[PDB]
Design a protein around this nucleic acid. Sequence first.
RNA 1: AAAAAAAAAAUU
Length: 779
Amino acid sequence: MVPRRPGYGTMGKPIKLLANCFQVEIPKIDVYLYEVDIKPDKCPRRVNREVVDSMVQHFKVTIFGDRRPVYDGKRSLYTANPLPVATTGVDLDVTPFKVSIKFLLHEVLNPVHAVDVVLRHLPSMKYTPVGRSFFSAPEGYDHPLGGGREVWFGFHQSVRPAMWKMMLNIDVSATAFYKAQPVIQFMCEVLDIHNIDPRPLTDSHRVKFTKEIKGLKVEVTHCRRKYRVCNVTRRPASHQTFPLQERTVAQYFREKYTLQLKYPHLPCLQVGQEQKHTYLPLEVCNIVAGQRCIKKLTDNQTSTMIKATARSAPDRQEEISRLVRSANYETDPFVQEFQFKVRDEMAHVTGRVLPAPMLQYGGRNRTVATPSHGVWDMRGKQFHTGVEIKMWAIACFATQRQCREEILKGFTDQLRKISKDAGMPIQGQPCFCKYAQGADSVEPMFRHLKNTYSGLQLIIVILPGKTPVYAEVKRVGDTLLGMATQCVQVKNVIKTSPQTLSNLCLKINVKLGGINNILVPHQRPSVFQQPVIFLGADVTHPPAKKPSIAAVVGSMDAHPSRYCATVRVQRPRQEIIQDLASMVRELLIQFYKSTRFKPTRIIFYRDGVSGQFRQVLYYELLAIREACISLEKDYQPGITYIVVQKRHHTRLFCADRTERVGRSGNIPAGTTVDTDITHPYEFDFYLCSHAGIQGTSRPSHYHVLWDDNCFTADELQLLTYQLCHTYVRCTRSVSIPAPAYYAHLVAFRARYHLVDRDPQALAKAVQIHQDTLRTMYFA
RNA sequence: AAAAAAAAAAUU
């Protein structure tokens, strides 16, 4: 099972820190659960909670005595002392239907969640709950995004049984909502028309409008009643008719609610079903307040949201500080019935900052490089093994008007200038260059490109921006012909910022196969005395029918530097990797043909997990094992599987203003916090592997859920840290170890391959040509 | 797509 903690690390310089985690004391008396059944079940959880609470208030005199309870909004009731109920329950009805209701943690350190509903049922009565977080409309404010879409500021709130006490996480959320507004003004926003008041209804407009409003809710008149939208009518309000004792919706509203439609050419809204024959015009329809955005946001909208949330750790912590005392949790009738005590102060925890390892470079200088706070440069330092390019070609998919002769001449000259100093000589003039336009000129250009040039290594496409050609360029370069790419936008082919080019050298030198740097081997954990292979993993889902994509990368050196890559397609919204076994098989074979050793140690990071450990650890660990028991006998390689979490709501701030680093005032790279806030029994730990430059850092939470290598806590912590510096696209420290960052790009560069028998079209679409399977293409 | 990091993933 999940191996317990082998110990706590002590290497590294200690530092005092603060976690948005609050210790909670839970009372000795047992908790009694009272199930509540309501009928029917055709309404939101908020409506359920409202009806039961109003019920309790109306008839509390004898039914409930003098007591204040909490309730999960659904079917779970909590009280402090045994409730005055009879047998299976008492026939009680609140109006609006008839409800019949049918009626540890200390020792371990339902009962864990039972406290959650108590600390959650006061704010859940207040704000708009979104699963685990809440939101409040900004009182006297506006934060629009366009298209009638807003963003509201709220907070995540989850309890966790931290080691030695119950603990409650509070952390700011900033997610998108929909502006309560007239459906007309909303429609005007959606169709990018300010005020059209010719568009009677272009048939495609009639469907593009419902493309977004379909499946929303709406309120009648202008503020009433409330109904659920289902579709836009084909014929307008003056025409669409429903039978009553058969009036059109226009004449009906014209003669029974004495309201003349200003816009009778506009369509109607379906509510309920296409059988209830219930119809509502847009004029008398306001959007309800509190709607959430499930549709995928545009890139620009995502950037605007990012700006809304990227604030520095110092002045942000002082908003969490307010947030905990804002609801005044020790003055809540719900928690004080059950004697709940919290700490309105932050959690003090002393972590340890591991030492990043010095990196070995080559060329003439043989310079060892030491990283400072996550960064190191390369000026006057040559690659460990840089490549020499005899042949290479340019393909500008911007027009001649933007990109011109003398601008490539300058750009290429500058790059050839810096690359030879960087240890990767790009001497000679490019044997080929041609301007191009569109997504469709790509493919035959590239086929002629292979057949006429023998010895042609790399092609650098110069695109203008977000053009459909990128998907083609990648899709072709990988799966059709199997030669190496490196794009660039004209924006950067014009200005030759050296840090831009010197990054381009890093990506390109490894896409041809070279190795930019290695670790000075004597500063490595004990795991490098023996053969060990490292494996990343990610799973990218669609928003929505589009499939999920799964990817794995494999260590191919002992530094470990180079990585091979494979990838598979799978069902929507499914989380587990279906064919991990054979992917590991092919990569173990790749390792056996690169280093000529059978690997004895497998160290295996995984990202993309949501209550999904019970089912993925046990399954994927055997999918690896049978990849091993698939080859020969006496092959029981040691598998240690670690799961990384870039998506919690745990943060850590420095407890000394002198230490608050940078203009974001963020925490340093390489801190480890496996004590106090972490899970007790299970072997997990936090490592803020990166350097926070913008906003406020998210620390990576690594859960070691299996360890056959009996790793001492330091042997594993330092190891994951040294791995985090093995990234090639930049000389910086990333949040997750390089393999976990590689399967992310593979799965991210398979959805460009998707965007264009049935299994073979979508299966071959991802599988790369053999001449580019042995390469670092994803970077 | 030079780059790491920062952002939610009863009516009609």
